[PDB]
Nucleic acid binder design. Structure first.
Ligand SMILES: CN[C@@H]1[C@@H](O)[C@@H](O[C@@H]2[C@@H](O)[C@H](O[C@H]3O[C@H]([C@@H](C)O)[C@@H](O)[C@H](O)[C@H]3N)[C@@H](N)C[C@H]2N)OC[C@]1(C)O
Ligand SMILES: CN[C@@H]1[C@@H](O)[C@@H](O[C@@H]2[C@@H](O)[C@H](O[C@H]3O[C@H]([C@@H](C)O)[C@@H](O)[C@H](O)[C@H]3N)[C@@H](N)C[C@H]2N)OC[C@]1(C)O
Ligand SMILES: [Mg+2]
Ligand SMILES: [Mg+2]
Ligand SMILES: [Mg+2]
Ligand SMILES: [Mg+2]
Ligand SMILES: [Mg+2]
Ligand SMILES: [Mg+2]
Ligand SMILES: [Mg+2]
Ligand SMILES: [Mg+2]
Ligand SMILES: [Mg+2]
Ligand SMILES: [Mg+2]
Ligand SMILES: [Mg+2]
Ligand SMILES: [Mg+2]
Ligand SMILES: [Mg+2]
Ligand SMILES: [Mg+2]
Ligand SMILES: [Mg+2]
Ligand SMILES: [Mg+2]
Ligand SMILES: [Mg+2]
Ligand SMILES: [Mg+2]
Ligand SMILES: [Mg+2]
Ligand SMILES: [Mg+2]
Ligand SMILES: [Mg+2]
Ligand SMILES: [Mg+2]
Ligand SMILES: [Mg+2]
Ligand SMILES: [Mg+2]
Ligand SMILES: [Mg+2]
Ligand SMILES: [Mg+2]
Ligand SMILES: [Mg+2]
Ligand SMILES: [Mg+2]
Ligand SMILES: [Mg+2]
Ligand SMILES: [Mg+2]
Ligand SMILES: [Mg+2]
Ligand SMILES: [Mg+2]
Ligand SMILES: [Mg+2]
Ligand SMILES: [Mg+2]
Ligand SMILES: [Mg+2]
Ligand SMILES: [Mg+2]
Ligand SMILES: [Mg+2]
Ligand SMILES: [Mg+2]
Ligand SMILES: [Mg+2]
Ligand SMILES: [Mg+2]
Ligand SMILES: [Mg+2]
Ligand SMILES: [Mg+2]
Ligand SMILES: [Mg+2]
Ligand SMILES: [Mg+2]
Ligand SMILES: [Mg+2]
Ligand SMILES: [Mg+2]
Ligand SMILES: [Mg+2]
Ligand SMILES: [Mg+2]
Ligand SMILES: [Mg+2]
Ligand SMILES: [Mg+2]
Ligand SMILES: [Mg+2]
Ligand SMILES: [Mg+2]
Ligand SMILES: [Mg+2]
Ligand SMILES: [Mg+2]
Ligand SMILES: [Mg+2]
Ligand SMILES: [Mg+2]
Ligand SMILES: [Mg+2]
Ligand SMILES: [Mg+2]
Ligand SMILES: [Mg+2]
Ligand SMILES: [Mg+2]
Ligand SMILES: [Mg+2]
Ligand SMILES: [Mg+2]
Ligand SMILES: [Mg+2]
Ligand SMILES: [Mg+2]
Ligand SMILES: [Mg+2]
Ligand SMILES: [Mg+2]
Ligand SMILES: [Mg+2]
Ligand SMILES: [Mg+2]
Ligand SMILES: [Mg+2]
Ligand SMILES: [Mg+2]
Ligand SMILES: [Mg+2]
Ligand SMILES: [Mg+2]
Ligand SMILES: [Mg+2]
Ligand SMILES: [Mg+2]
Ligand SMILES: [Mg+2]
Ligand SMILES: [Mg+2]
Ligand SMILES: [Mg+2]
Ligand SMILES: [Mg+2]
Ligand SMILES: [Mg+2]
Ligand SMILES: [Mg+2]
Ligand SMILES: [Mg+2]
Ligand SMILES: [Mg+2]
Ligand SMILES: [Mg+2]
Ligand SMILES: [Mg+2]
Ligand SMILES: [Mg+2]
Ligand SMILES: [Mg+2]
Ligand SMILES: [Mg+2]
Ligand SMILES: [Mg+2]
Ligand SMILES: [Mg+2]
Ligand SMILES: [Mg+2]
Ligand SMILES: [Mg+2]
Ligand SMILES: [Mg+2]
Ligand SMILES: [Mg+2]
Lengths: 148, 51, 185, 159, 58, 49
RNA sequence: GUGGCCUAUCGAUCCUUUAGUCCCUCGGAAUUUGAGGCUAGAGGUGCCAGAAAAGUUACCACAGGGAUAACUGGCUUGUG
RNA sequence: GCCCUGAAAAUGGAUGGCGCUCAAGCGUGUUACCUAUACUCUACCGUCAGGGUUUGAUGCCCUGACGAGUAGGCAGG
RNA sequence: AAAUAUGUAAGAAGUCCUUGUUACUUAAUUGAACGUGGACAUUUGAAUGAAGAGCUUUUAGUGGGCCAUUUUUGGUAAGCAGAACUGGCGAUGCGGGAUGAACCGAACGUAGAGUUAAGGUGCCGGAAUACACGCUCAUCAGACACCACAAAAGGUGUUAG
RNA sequence: GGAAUACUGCCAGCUGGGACUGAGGACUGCGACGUAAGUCAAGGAUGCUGGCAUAAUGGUUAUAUGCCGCCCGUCUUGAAACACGGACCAAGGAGUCUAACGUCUAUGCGAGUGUUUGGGUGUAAAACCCAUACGCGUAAUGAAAGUGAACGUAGGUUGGGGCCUCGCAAGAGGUGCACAAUCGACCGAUCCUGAUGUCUUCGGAUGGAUUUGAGUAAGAGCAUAGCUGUUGGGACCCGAAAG
RNA sequence: GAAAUUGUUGAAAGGGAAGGGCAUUUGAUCAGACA
């Protein structure tokens, strides 16, 4: 609100906190990004290393669909099972029955390896995995089924 | 709540330093000294009065 | 007049009370200010202060950090104290029992502490059971974990990350970021 | 146009010390510098490689690195309102062990002694250092020395 | 229009506000710049003695 | 017009952008009106769903 | 022994052009041309942190400046 | 050493003015005295701080120190 | 070869014994670097000071300065031009310099009493037309830092050498 | 030879005159005088008397008198200035709003979080409810194809608040979060190493490297709001010669 | 029915402006208090 604002406080001091010498004028720098390459280079270098020019390959008509590949670590992976059913599959580690986790269902495109999932085997249906993910799954007795 | 000075106001001069009682009672400000008669070497009064 | 050795009329620059208007919070202050003065117990004075800290200085203590804290030698049977809110961590499968005195609890942490047979205590209950704060454990959340302190001290060859909206190639990766264009940082 | 090149103004600083020019006596190359030693930095104009910059002449520092010909030294240089840590690569021609620490260690060794020597005697040590203390009372003798009286002298020209 | 050129006037006073803070010493200083060969051994030299205080409690 | 450490913004009001501003002050008014237009079909439409 | 005994002898982004692996992409799929990329140098900015640039206004104009010239005054006093 | 001479400028004029000549001048010595928003002591105001104290507890109470300010910042109003 | 200014040191992150690790290094289990373990105490290592110390973010104004003593460049000089250290003025009143941005004094909440500073005490004007030894008589006397100027050269004026 | 006195200093020696101040408001402290009971000038004024009880004190006001006081605003090293604006009065008269954002702080919830496009509903622009999606987090590094976070109690070491143990205490040991410093480890880029194997050129295991990243290493976010700050907009208000 | 500004009445002061600060006298005018 206006009533809290410093500009109320500046009522009665001439310059409005703007200064008596250097005043407050229209555009002492130039407008916007003007002179990144000249007077403003000291700010533009540091604070924005990398601004000017180009770097590698263009792409004509890119579409981020094809790139949809959400990532889920074995940090979690067990979050895809609701918690009643979950402790149920936790105890009784066995093949012949093991939980079926369809990750592409859960919104994901790849399984990463973050770490430490229980000794409990799981069948993880997935689109892609890391070599380290799919290893740890196999160190709990589980496997990986590629799906689409 | 008010600083009072010793050196006047006996009461507090006697609050600190009760040896105050003794000093005043025995004088000692005014203590005489032991008169001795020792005289300076005639070398001294030569070089004192010398040119 | 006076040659002045240090700045005059210097506010001590320590929060005297919370900036918060929460009544209950203020009461916890009222409690611990009493405890702090009379108890002579260190643990109290600390918690008084930490009751002042802003959101920034009350980082969420994750339930798993509490797990790890208790695995300390002889530290299993202490009661962990968090001035701040405590958070549910999916990433532990096992969890210990104990007792957690905390200003706030998120839904899961409470569910996760109780389900394992532990107890979610409000701080004044901790004052009742622990007046001098005996057999207590204090755990601070990570402060510099925050995403703002990413950008602090951004400079050439500080590798400090820039303030920027859209990221990728095309975005502050060219001049001065690579020896092939200008210099590198 | 104004000039500052690396060696500017160093004319008399790097100059070779009268009757002391020429190749460098071998004890210089003999001394062994272990990391953490306290070094004095003095350039030797005959040795152009591994040469300190003119700022660091007179400076004292400590050696963080030991390579073939050269001890890397850190110096705290003041710039602006702070000091930055600076790292110099110097050939040992330009370096010498600093004797600042000399009395220290000698006092350290001295202190441990006076400690076990007085303690194994039943303590009463007082091993800290004291500034010069005002003189004590003394008698002085006039025997064979009578005061010889003195007068200021009248003006004379003699040129 | 000709103007002043340079001076160090007052520039000292301004430093001694925030006062010329001292160099900031630390124990365990940085190995940045140390002889790379000396580090590549020093690595395997600590690695051993860590494994040797690990069999000391065993 | 460049200072401090601030992300470079891009905020594209260089045209007379105040000439095209739609506030939807009808957000309520339309939500009513297209309910009333739904009632008018469901009756005019006979039991059809 | 990592050019000239030391203290000087030099040059961004865009662009073109070469060197390098024979590596990455031209997005329906391939092969073969052609095109793009990364790493590294050159083509040059000398106003040397780096615009693409001729004059006249005795017909003139605006913003300003005593931050600055033409005169009185003030310091100076070589010169007179 | 003091004094004289060297010593010419324009409105009428300035040891600040009057005036002063064993000074009210010059050199030097000794006292006494006069009086700054400074120094000391006390009252009051504010600010900062360190304590005390569960019924204005955002409170009350004790104690000490400090107080110049354009551009400017923050604060309570 | 000074003076003034200048680098580092004055300890627990210290000193000493013992003997581990390695792909470095030595003829060499040599040495290097980091170490396990053990010993050494208080007066933890000169003075002085300290209410404190360390640390982080963010942002205003500003980015024409000027002056004084000393150092110092150009210039015949300049209230000129231009550097060095510091203190100032600017941004600051108060007492003194009659007056005056920068000199002296001293810096500022409202008051009281005391005492002072710099400067003064014939009268204007608060305060000795005080005391004391001298010098000085000007038909242009002289009279107080910064400061509002004077010189070479002369006097058988008088004074003391 | 014996004194005196000056001079300098000391006294917890005694005492006259004058000025200003009287903060505080039961008691509590340090003491002091007393054989004592008591008393006191001992942690801040009380006792005695008189006048008036009213414009007498005082407030306000005009004025006279002593001393002091130059026009404000502004730009400026410097302004009372022979610098500019201002004859007078009233009423207007200038850092806003919006989009996108930085730091801080409050709040709701939290590995997630954002009802308000829209739908349901209403006492009808309000309040109340909600399905899927989306946005932003939870993975990074590469120009890219693409690869993608535990040797170990998520590591070693130094300091760490708090807590634990011993001790009456002084002290000693234990554990040690945030944070700080350092030595390692893990992911991607870069350079090398190239096992088992096989379309004979695919495959890239294993071990490395003064190289590098806005990474990992028991999550800190997302959303509302406020101050201050940014940029674009008529962008604090008024002003061109032009086009 | 404000201000600038103006008439008349009342009061006051005024030797080349007026206005201000400290302080008191004097004129005028008033609150409070006490009982
Ligand atoms: C400060 N006021 C001054 C006033 O004092 C005077 O200025 C003098 C001027 O007279 C002096 O100058 C003059 O007078 C002096 C002598 C009197 O010192 C002579 O030496 C000099 O040759 C002459 N020009 C000059 N040296 C300093 C200024 N302040 O005249 C000018 C003025 C502005 O009125
Ligand atoms: C009420 N108006 C004023 C009034 O105040 C009074 O003015 C005096 C004035 O006369 C005094 O007197 C002074 O002023 C006058 C005036 C004519 O300039 C001078 O002639 C006189 O020399 C001077 N002493 C002056 N010292 C203070 C004012 N209060 O005199 C009448 C008036 C000027 O009209
Ligand atoms: Mg202005
Ligand atoms: Mg401002
Ligand atoms: Mg500006
Ligand atoms: Mg340019
Ligand atoms: Mg930078
Ligand atoms: Mg670009
Ligand atoms: Mg990617
Ligand atoms: Mg598919
Ligand atoms: Mg003061
Ligand atoms: Mg101040
Ligand atoms: Mg030169
Ligand atoms: Mg020499
Ligand atoms: Mg060379
Ligand atoms: Mg210019
Ligand atoms: Mg000039
Ligand atoms: Mg300049
Ligand atoms: Mg220049
Ligand atoms: Mg319609
Ligand atoms: Mg070689
Ligand atoms: Mg070379
Ligand atoms: Mg040669
Ligand atoms: Mg080039
Ligand atoms: Mg295509
Ligand atoms: Mg293709
Ligand atoms: Mg240029
Ligand atoms: Mg240039
Ligand atoms: Mg033209
Ligand atoms: Mg013509
Ligand atoms: Mg003509
Ligand atoms: Mg014509
Ligand atoms: Mg001029
Ligand atoms: Mg002239
Ligand atoms: Mg001349
Ligand atoms: Mg002249
Ligand atoms: Mg003369
Ligand atoms: Mg005269
Ligand atoms: Mg006089
Ligand atoms: Mg005299
Ligand atoms: Mg006298
Ligand atoms: Mg307080
Ligand atoms: Mg308090
Ligand atoms: Mg102030
Ligand atoms: Mg201001
Ligand atoms: Mg020490
Ligand atoms: Mg040890
Ligand atoms: Mg100027
Ligand atoms: Mg300017
Ligand atoms: Mg001048
Ligand atoms: Mg000048
Ligand atoms: Mg000058
Ligand atoms: Mg200015
Ligand atoms: Mg001022
Ligand atoms: Mg001043
Ligand atoms: Mg004055
Ligand atoms: Mg003055
Ligand atoms: Mg006073
Ligand atoms: Mg006084
Ligand atoms: Mg007069
Ligand atoms: Mg008088
Ligand atoms: Mg006389
Ligand atoms: Mg006399
Ligand atoms: Mg004068
Ligand atoms: Mg005497
Ligand atoms: Mg009283
Ligand atoms: Mg009586
Ligand atoms: Mg009466
Ligand atoms: Mg009266
Ligand atoms: Mg009056
Ligand atoms: Mg008046
Ligand atoms: Mg005056
Ligand atoms: Mg102006
Ligand atoms: Mg000017
Ligand atoms: Mg002015
Ligand atoms: Mg003028
Ligand atoms: Mg002007
Ligand atoms: Mg103008
Ligand atoms: Mg004017
Ligand atoms: Mg006007
Ligand atoms: Mg006008
Ligand atoms: Mg979501
Ligand atoms: Mg530790
Ligand atoms: Mg400690
Ligand atoms: Mg291959
Ligand atoms: Mg405008
Ligand atoms: Mg804006
Ligand atoms: Mg216009
Ligand atoms: Mg037009
Ligand atoms: Mg045009
Ligand atoms: Mg009127
Ligand atoms: Mg007249
Ligand atoms: Mg006047
Ligand atoms: Mg007239
Ligand atoms: Mg008056």
């Amino acid at each position: 609100p206006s009533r809290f604002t410093k500009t109320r406080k500046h009522r009665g001091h001439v310059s409005a906190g703007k200064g008596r010498i250097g005043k407050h004028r229209k555009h002492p720098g130039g407008r916007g990004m003007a002179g990144g390459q000249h007077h403003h280079r000291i700010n533009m270098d540091k604070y924005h290393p990398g601004y000017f020019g180009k770097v590698g390959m263009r792409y004509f008509h890119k579409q981020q669909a094809h790139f949809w590949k959400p990532v889920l670590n074995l940090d979690k992976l067990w979050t895809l099972i609701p918690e009643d059913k979950r402790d149920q599959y936790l105890k009784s580690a066995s093949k012949e029955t093991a939980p079926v986790i369809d990750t592409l269902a859960a919104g994901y495109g790849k399984i990463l390896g973050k770490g430490r999932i229980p000794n409990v085997p799981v069948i993880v249906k997935a689109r892609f995995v890391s070599k380290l993910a799919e290893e740890k799954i196999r160190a709990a007795g589980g496997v990986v089924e590629l799906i689409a | 709540v008010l600083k009072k000075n010793p050196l006047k106001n006996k009461q507090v001069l006697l609050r600190l330093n009760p040896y105050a009682k003794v000093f005043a009672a025995e004088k000692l400000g005014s203590k005489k000294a032991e008169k001795t008669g020792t005289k300076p070497a005639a070398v001294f009064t030569e070089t004192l009065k010398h040119d | 007049g006076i040659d002045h050795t240090s700045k005059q009329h210097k506010r001590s620059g320590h929060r005297t009370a919370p900036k918060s208007d929460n009544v209950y919070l203020k009461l916890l202050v009222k409690l611990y200010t009493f405890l702090a003065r009379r108890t002579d117990a260190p643990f109290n004075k600390v918690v008084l202060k930490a009751l002042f800290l802003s959101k920034i200085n009350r980082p969420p203590v994750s339930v798993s950090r509490i797990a790890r804290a208790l695995k300390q030698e002889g530290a299993a049977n202490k009661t962990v104290v968090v001035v701040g809110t405590v958070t549910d961590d999916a990433r532990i499968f096992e969890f210990p029992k104990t007792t957690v005195a905390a200003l706030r609890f998120t839904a899961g942490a409470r569910a996760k502490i109780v389900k394992a047979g532990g107890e979610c205590i409000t701080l004044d209950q901790l004052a009742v059971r622990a007046p001098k704060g005996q057999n207590t454990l204090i755990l601070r959340g990570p402060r510099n974990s925050r995403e703002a302190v990413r950008h602090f001290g951004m400079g050439p060859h500080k590798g400090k990350a820039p303030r920027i909206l859209s990221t990728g190639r095309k975005f502050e990766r060219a001049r001065g970021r690579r020896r092939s264009k200008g210099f590198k940082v | 146009g104004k000039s500052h090149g690396y060696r500017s103004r160093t004319r008399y600083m790097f100059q070779r010390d009268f009757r002391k020019h020429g190749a460098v006596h071998l004890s210089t190359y003999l001394k062994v510098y272990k990391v953490g030693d306290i070094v004095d930095i003095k350039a030797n104009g005959s040795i152009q490689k591994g040469m300190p910059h003119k700022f660091y002449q007179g400076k004292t520092g400590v050696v963080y690195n030991v390579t073939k010909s050269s001890v890397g030294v850190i110096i705290n240089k003041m710039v602006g309102n702070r000091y930055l840590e600076k790292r110099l690569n110097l050939r040992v021609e330009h370096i010498k062990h600093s004797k600042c620490r000399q009395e220290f260690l000698e006092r350290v060794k001295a202190n441990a002694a006076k400690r076990a020597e007085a303690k194994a005697q039943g303590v009463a040590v007082q091993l800290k250092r004291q500034p010069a203390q005002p003189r004590e009372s003394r008698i002085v003798s006039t025997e064979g020395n009578v005061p010889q009286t003195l007068a200021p002298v009248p003006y004379e020209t003699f040129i | 229009a000709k103007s002043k050129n340079h001076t160090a006037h007052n520039q000292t006073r301004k430093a001694h506000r925030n006062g010329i803070k001292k160099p900031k010493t630390y124990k365990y200083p940085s190995l940045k710049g140390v002889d790379p060969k000396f580090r590549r051994n020093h690595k395997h030299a600590l690695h051993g003695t860590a494994k040797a205080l690990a069999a000391a409690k065993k | 017009a460049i200072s401090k450490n601030l992300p470079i913004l891009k905020n594209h009001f260089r045209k007379h952008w105040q000439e095209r501003v739609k506030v939807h002050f009808d957000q309520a008014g339309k939500k009513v009106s297209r309910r009333n237009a739904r009632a008018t079909r469901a009756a005019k439409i006979a039991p059809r769903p």
